[PDB]
Amino acid sequence: MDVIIGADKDGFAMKEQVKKYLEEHQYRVADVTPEPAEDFVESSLAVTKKLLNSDAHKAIMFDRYGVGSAMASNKVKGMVTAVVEEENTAHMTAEHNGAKAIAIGTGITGYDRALVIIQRYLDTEYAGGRHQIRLDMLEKMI
């Protein structure tokens, strides 16, 4: 399974830890920010571009609060980014939403919790079915 990751200066430290975690678990990781991005708009958009052009369907954005990376990346047509700070949304956003990526705020979420969130996200597949109408509506928007 492929996973795209990116981060700004505030999310860089955690991004590095997660990358190590992902590699140790056999995941093929595409890091779009070997060096911290200028800001979360740059990192979140970098992850989005790489994702929508790759065969991967899982991505993780890191910044101080998560809110920013989601706010910025969701402006991209076809993109769906979920800010995640607890373990239910971690899987539900993948199951119900397109959740092409999740955003974690390093100033909000501790590392051990972030890992549980990430693993639940990566382990969950989109359910399709009735949920597709909402995704079709979202992909139609700017």
């Binding site: 979360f40 708009v41 706010m71 909000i108 109408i133 928007m141």
Partner: protein, 172 residues
Amino acid sequence: MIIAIGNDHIVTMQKIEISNMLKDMGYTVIDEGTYDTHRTHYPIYGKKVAEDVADGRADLGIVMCGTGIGISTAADKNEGIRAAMCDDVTSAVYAREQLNANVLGIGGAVVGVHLIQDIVKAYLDATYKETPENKKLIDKIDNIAKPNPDQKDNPHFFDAELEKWAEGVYHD
């Protein structure tokens, strides 16, 4: 001040609690989200709330669904909106003070009512304080999307999907 609010069927009860609170606080509320708990689609209400805010019918917006991700993302995908998905007080205050977010998204179903009330109150009480740094971030965010006149102020934008739904195209 005018607050527009919306929701999908999973969190109508939580929306009602917030609507009640907002009115008690002195806000004028424009309820757009769904009014009952019959299965419906979060993008419809997120778009309605987004346009109320973007068109000046409302000062700020609040949208909720099970996780908040769906409806807040729908709200964000509109001209003039900066929607912040915040299940906590800290990031909600950050959203208002630093990103001048004008739409707040919350996950009913995952956040307890008392905390939802705190998030809303903190968000509303916060004030945007411009800085050379966040002004630049905001400008970037406001220019990522390409405006689509066919979506702007078009309440029939999702009609094609609604018909496909009525025709059983989206069966499980």
